[PDB]
Design a protein around this ligand. Structure first.
Ligand SMILES: [Mg+2]
Ligand SMILES: [Mg+2]
Ligand SMILES: [Mg+2]
Ligand SMILES: [Mg+2]
Ligand SMILES: [Mg+2]
Ligand SMILES: [Mg+2]
Ligand SMILES: [Mg+2]
Ligand SMILES: [Mg+2]
Ligand SMILES: [Mg+2]
Ligand SMILES: [Mg+2]
Ligand SMILES: [Mg+2]
Ligand SMILES: [Mg+2]
Ligand SMILES: [Mg+2]
Ligand SMILES: [Mg+2]
Ligand SMILES: [Mg+2]
Ligand SMILES: [Mg+2]
Ligand SMILES: [Mg+2]
Ligand SMILES: [Mg+2]
Ligand SMILES: [Mg+2]
Ligand SMILES: [Mg+2]
Ligand SMILES: [Mg+2]
Ligand SMILES: [Mg+2]
Ligand SMILES: [Mg+2]
Ligand SMILES: [Mg+2]
Ligand SMILES: [Mg+2]
Ligand SMILES: [Mg+2]
Ligand SMILES: [Mg+2]
Ligand SMILES: [Mg+2]
Ligand SMILES: [Mg+2]
Ligand SMILES: [Mg+2]
Ligand SMILES: [Mg+2]
Ligand SMILES: [Mg+2]
Ligand SMILES: [Mg+2]
Ligand SMILES: [Mg+2]
Ligand SMILES: [Mg+2]
Ligand SMILES: [Mg+2]
Ligand SMILES: [Mg+2]
Ligand SMILES: [Mg+2]
Ligand SMILES: [Mg+2]
Ligand SMILES: [Mg+2]
Ligand SMILES: [Mg+2]
Ligand SMILES: [Mg+2]
Ligand SMILES: [Mg+2]
Ligand SMILES: [Mg+2]
Ligand SMILES: [Mg+2]
Ligand SMILES: [Mg+2]
Ligand SMILES: [Mg+2]
Ligand SMILES: [Mg+2]
Ligand SMILES: [Mg+2]
Ligand SMILES: [Mg+2]
Ligand SMILES: [Mg+2]
Ligand SMILES: [Mg+2]
Ligand SMILES: [Mg+2]
Ligand SMILES: [Mg+2]
Ligand SMILES: [Mg+2]
Ligand SMILES: [Mg+2]
Ligand SMILES: [Mg+2]
Ligand SMILES: [Mg+2]
Ligand SMILES: [Mg+2]
Ligand SMILES: [Mg+2]
Ligand SMILES: [Mg+2]
Ligand SMILES: [Mg+2]
Ligand SMILES: [Mg+2]
Ligand SMILES: [Mg+2]
Ligand SMILES: [Mg+2]
Ligand SMILES: [Mg+2]
Ligand SMILES: [Mg+2]
Ligand SMILES: [Mg+2]
Ligand SMILES: [Mg+2]
Ligand SMILES: [Mg+2]
Ligand SMILES: [Mg+2]
Ligand SMILES: [Mg+2]
Lengths: 86, 199, 122, 80, 133
RNA sequence: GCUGAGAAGCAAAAGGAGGAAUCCGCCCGAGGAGGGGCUCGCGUCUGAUUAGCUAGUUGGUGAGGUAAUAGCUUACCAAGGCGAUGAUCAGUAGCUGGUCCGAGAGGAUGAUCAGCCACACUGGGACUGAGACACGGCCCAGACUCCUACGGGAGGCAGCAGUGGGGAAUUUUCCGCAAUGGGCGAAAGCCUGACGGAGCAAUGCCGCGUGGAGGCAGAAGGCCCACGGGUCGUGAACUUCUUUUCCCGGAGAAGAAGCAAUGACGGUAUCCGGGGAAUAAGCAUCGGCUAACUCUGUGCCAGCAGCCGCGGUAAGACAGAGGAUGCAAGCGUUAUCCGGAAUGAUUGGGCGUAAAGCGUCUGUAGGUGGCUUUUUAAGUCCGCCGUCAAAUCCCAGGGCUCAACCCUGGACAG
RNA sequence: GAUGCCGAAGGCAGGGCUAGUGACUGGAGUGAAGUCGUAACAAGGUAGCCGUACUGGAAGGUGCGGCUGGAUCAC
């Protein structure tokens, strides 16, 4: 399906990262949307990603008792690069 | 499961009920004690309406209820659909065709296997009749004799336009579905529908 | 009131509390009478009411009302109790079904007989 | 293996079968992969949807005697 | 001014209940469009724009008193729906209709703002701004 | 084919039928479908008078292990992981299609029927095998029952019946493999307490009956009565018609599938004849809510009651009688759940005096947040596809004489 | 056959949680009628109430602050 985009809370460990993914859900009864946040152990060979990074999160085989997810380069995001002003 | 009790009696309290009795009530002779309940609670008016219906067709309550559920289901005006359903009963059609004296009579007639609907014997009163249907007497001496005498000796020619009757073999024919104006009684179905809001 | 506050689970129901805890989700229970005696009703209803104490199978001891007119019940009799409340007598939440087990039917009652456990007269 | 057989529906004394493609180890009325035929003795009603039948006979579904001979009467074994 | 839409609505409701024909409201793409629509439905007499100190004001003339101010059979109701707390959306087959259609429902959709009528013609759902009686 | 960079190294078989043709098998690969194993998003009860929990624990390497990925194991290295959006701990609970209720939104529940999980006297092991950590297999320990010639053995109904016991309460130690489904067999066939059927029970839902028509307006009797009469009551008695049901005789299926044969149900369902109104109505209530009223007996007694409350001499509320009313082969009482209850409120309430604004501020998380243009497209919207098993609910036909029930087809929701 | 590792009951020991029970004791609730008093509701016979401290058989009393949900008079 669609992969999950998030930001990194912890880089400290080797070949891994700890991502936080925020999603909104329409709470079952009261029809307002809510932010629920979940954390993941993402496998990141090469340790390219630092803390604060905004990374896309992908699915693969189990690497550990926790990490199922491949850390993957940010998928599509709006350029924080300045644009013309006509 | 049938009302075998005193009839005249129910008639005094309800109103005029064709499917029950042809004998017009006694003067009523209650003019001595002059006993009334005062007037009737709105509830009692509703109740007496339903009872009118129920005893005219010889239906039990638990049955009437299920007719009413079938009614609320049906897409259409509820009281009307109900009155349709009640008026399509085999025994009642057997009655309104003059093939019977009254509804307990017609009912008995059906029970004893004296009637045919499209060349097949139906012995149950509540069999629902559908358009283009043949109402015949079984070909035996008894069946024919019954139908003949009760048909001929009763003069009423009121046949309500959806009902055909044909002379020697005595083929009755159900032509179509009842019209609200052709209904078999004076009843505001509105009151009955209302009574049944709580089921 | 505030949406954000309801989303913290601010609406919780009050559960249904039974009027007859001693039965434990049953139509009847059987018990043995520990005692059979009279009590006076809360004023202004004056009379003498026939109540027994019954020790049940579910282990409880309760005080059950005995209906009708007169009775044969005495201690170490095995009766059948059912629910329902006598608004007169404080604490009495249970009746005793007549005509079953050790309670006989009321003698000579002609009307509403099924409520008292009496045969039809021939 | 996959079997094409009858599952028994309807009521007491009046019995009506569906013809179904189902794994041989599920119960007689248990869950299945595909519903295919319809059968009935008393109304002498019988008919089948053949594209499915053939697509299962092709992947190696084995029929049961009764069914076998139903497919026979309807000439599905010739096309095969 | 946490909600701008609700506020416009309110200024109307208030000026209406007090039997004044004239209201000052603060303009915006939303405001302007809503008022346009209000005019083409016919709930309001006339609109116009004003400007001072880089502020825009739509003044609204309002339907005259009903055959006196004391004896009023009719008022002109307004109700916010989707509001910052809970946003209400509807597909095509849930699109609201008001008092059998006597009143109107405003919708913001992909094709811009409209009434429920337009939404039904074009087959679109969207965010329900408010109802009007 | 498998190991391996390679060099190389290493691995298989089974015959039985038939006179022969040929058949069923056997070994090694490579596919298919079905059946299992794993991994992850989402959804999946109450408790803060449960606040910190976790050290193979969270990750890294090396060696092992598994059918396969994995702290699955082990050694070393690192210090993580989870947690006030409720971790851990305690308490309850099999879950889901569904069922019941609700105008809807949603509440309560998870019998039968169908899917999945888990378990097999209480705990732990493995073995065999494609598949088990195996209900009617093995081993051990324990608890319990039996047999024993005393040295030793045997066993596991939460399989179908059945017995004790607990309990308000839940059935025959039945017939049959004829149908469908399984197992093995070349087939003939054998075995199937799955299943197909019967029996018992108003437990429930649905159908039918207990008569139909006529019946002086005269008589017996009950009850009321200002003694005039009223009412039970066209009700019965009475006269005719009819026979579903009952009784006594006859014939007698489909269900069986393409060679005939083969039916537990069963001589049952149905059909033809002969009698004969003949064989068949009870139960609640009658003070208000709530449809239906009077009289005799009692006297704060005996008793009734869902709530208000009735009952101290004329009780429409007690008990009896007559009468009426409601339902009807059922009618009531109790238990359980939802409703009504807008009484836990999103739709749908409140907080000056009725229950309810912290004593007042500052402020962290969290929620909401002015206007204009552009971008993006996460929500949002529209189209198309996959799926949300069948059964159930809903619509449209069809079959059992009707209905309940069964069968075919199709679909909104979400 | 023996032996190592892991190992279920079994043993001991201290924990946490909960179940039952216990001399006696503290208060709560309902009991027409008993005792003592009469605190509250009228300016309730000393205005009442809130917090708090001290005392009193008991309702209470007084102090210190606050409020009117205080009557009388002031308008
Ligand atoms: Mg019935
Ligand atoms: Mg009666
Ligand atoms: Mg019949
Ligand atoms: Mg209702
Ligand atoms: Mg309730
Ligand atoms: Mg045939
Ligand atoms: Mg939606
Ligand atoms: Mg070799
Ligand atoms: Mg041979
Ligand atoms: Mg040979
Ligand atoms: Mg649940
Ligand atoms: Mg280690
Ligand atoms: Mg459990
Ligand atoms: Mg409701
Ligand atoms: Mg069970
Ligand atoms: Mg099952
Ligand atoms: Mg056991
Ligand atoms: Mg093996
Ligand atoms: Mg297992
Ligand atoms: Mg086994
Ligand atoms: Mg066993
Ligand atoms: Mg058993
Ligand atoms: Mg027993
Ligand atoms: Mg017992
Ligand atoms: Mg047998
Ligand atoms: Mg067989
Ligand atoms: Mg077979
Ligand atoms: Mg075979
Ligand atoms: Mg069976
Ligand atoms: Mg019987
Ligand atoms: Mg029955
Ligand atoms: Mg029976
Ligand atoms: Mg019973
Ligand atoms: Mg039973
Ligand atoms: Mg008669
Ligand atoms: Mg005859
Ligand atoms: Mg044959
Ligand atoms: Mg006959
Ligand atoms: Mg009344
Ligand atoms: Mg009574
Ligand atoms: Mg009740
Ligand atoms: Mg008196
Ligand atoms: Mg006297
Ligand atoms: Mg008297
Ligand atoms: Mg008198
Ligand atoms: Mg009485
Ligand atoms: Mg009586
Ligand atoms: Mg509610
Ligand atoms: Mg609200
Ligand atoms: Mg309120
Ligand atoms: Mg107050
Ligand atoms: Mg207050
Ligand atoms: Mg304040
Ligand atoms: Mg404070
Ligand atoms: Mg602040
Ligand atoms: Mg902030
Ligand atoms: Mg913001
Ligand atoms: Mg804005
Ligand atoms: Mg389905
Ligand atoms: Mg239909
Ligand atoms: Mg039909
Ligand atoms: Mg279907
Ligand atoms: Mg869909
Ligand atoms: Mg005391
Ligand atoms: Mg006393
Ligand atoms: Mg005083
Ligand atoms: Mg004083
Ligand atoms: Mg005072
Ligand atoms: Mg002093
Ligand atoms: Mg002093
Ligand atoms: Mg003072
Ligand atoms: Mg102050």
């Amino acid at each position: 399906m669609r992969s999950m985009q998030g930001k990194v809370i912890c880089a400290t460990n080797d070949k891994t990262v700890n991502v936080e993914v925020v999603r909104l859900a329409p709470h079952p009864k009261y029809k307002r949307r809510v932010r629920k946040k979940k954390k993941y152990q993402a496998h990141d060979p090469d340790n390219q990603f630092k803390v604060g990074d905004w990374v896309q999160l992908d699915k693969c085989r189990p690497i550990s008792k926790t990490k199922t997810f491949l850390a993957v380069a940010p998928e599509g995001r709006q350029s924080s690069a300045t644009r013309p002003k006509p | 499961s049938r009302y075998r009790g005193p009839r005249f009696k129910k008639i005094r309290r309800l109103g005029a009920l064709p499917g029950l009795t042809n004998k017009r009530p006694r003067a009523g002779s209650d003019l001595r004690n002059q006993s009334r309940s005062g007037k009737r609670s709105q509830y009692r008016i509703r109740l007496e309406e339903k009872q009118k219906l129920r005893f005219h067709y010889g239906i039990t309550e638990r049955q009437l209820l299920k007719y009413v559920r079938i009614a609320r289901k049906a897409k259409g005006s509820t009281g009307q659909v109900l009155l349709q359903l009640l008026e399509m009963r085999l025994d009642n059609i057997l009655f309104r065709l003059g093939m019977a004296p009254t509804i307990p009579g017609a009912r008995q007639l059906v029970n004893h296997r004296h009637i045919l609907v499209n060349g097949r014997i139906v012995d149950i009163p509540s069999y629902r009749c559908k358009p283009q249907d043949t109402i015949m007497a079984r070909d035996e001496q008894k069946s024919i004799a019954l139908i003949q005498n009760s048909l001929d000796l009763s003069p009423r020619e009121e046949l309500p336009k959806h009902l055909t009757l044909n002379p020697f073999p005595y083929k009755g024919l159900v032509n179509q579905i009842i019209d609200s104006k052709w209904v078999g009684l004076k009843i505001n179905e509105l009151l009955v529908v209302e009574y049944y809001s709580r089921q | 009131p505030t949406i954000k506050q309801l989303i913290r689970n601010t609406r919780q129901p009050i559960r249904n509390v039974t009027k007859s805890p001693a039965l434990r989700g049953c139509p009847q229970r059987r018990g043995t009478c520990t005692r059979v005696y009279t009590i006076t009703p809360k004023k202004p209803n004056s009379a003498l009411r026939k109540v027994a104490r019954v020790r049940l199978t579910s282990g409880f001891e309760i005080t059950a009302y005995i209906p009708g007119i007169g009775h044969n019940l005495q201690e170490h009799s095995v009766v059948l109790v059912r629910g329902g409340r006598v608004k007169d007598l404080p604490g009495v939440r249970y009746h005793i079904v007549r005509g079953t087990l050790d309670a006989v039917g009321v003698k000579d009652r002609q009307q509403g007989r099924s409520k008292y456990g009496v045969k039809k007269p021939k | 293996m996959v079997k094409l057989r009858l599952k028994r529906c309807g009521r007491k004394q009046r019995a009506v079968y569906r013809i179904v493609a189902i794994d041989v180890r599920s119960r007689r009325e248990g869950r299945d992969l595909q519903k295919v035929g319809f059968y009935d003795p008393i109304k002498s009603q019988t008919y089948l949807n053949v594209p499915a039948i053939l697509d299962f006979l092709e992947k190696g579904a084995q029929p049961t005697e009764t069914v076998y001979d139903i497919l026979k009467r309807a000439e599905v074994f010739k096309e095969f | 001014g946490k909600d701008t839409i609700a506020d416009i609505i309110t200024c109307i409701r208030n000026a209406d209940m007090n039997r004044k024909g004239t209201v000052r409201i603060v303009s915006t793409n939303i405001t302007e469009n809503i008022v346009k629509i209000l005019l083409r439905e016919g709930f309001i007499e006339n609109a116009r724009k004003h400007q001072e100190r880089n502020k825009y004001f739509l003044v609204l003339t309002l339907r005259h008193r009903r055959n006196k101010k004391g004896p009023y059979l009719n008022t002109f109701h307004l109700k916010r729906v989707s509001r910052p707390g809970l946003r209400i959306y509807s597909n095509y087959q849930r699109i609201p209709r008001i008092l059998g259609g006597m009143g109107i429902a405003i919708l913001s959709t992909s094709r811009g703002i409209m009434t429920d009528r337009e939404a039904r013609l074009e087959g679109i759902g969207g965010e329900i701004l408010c109802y009007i009686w």
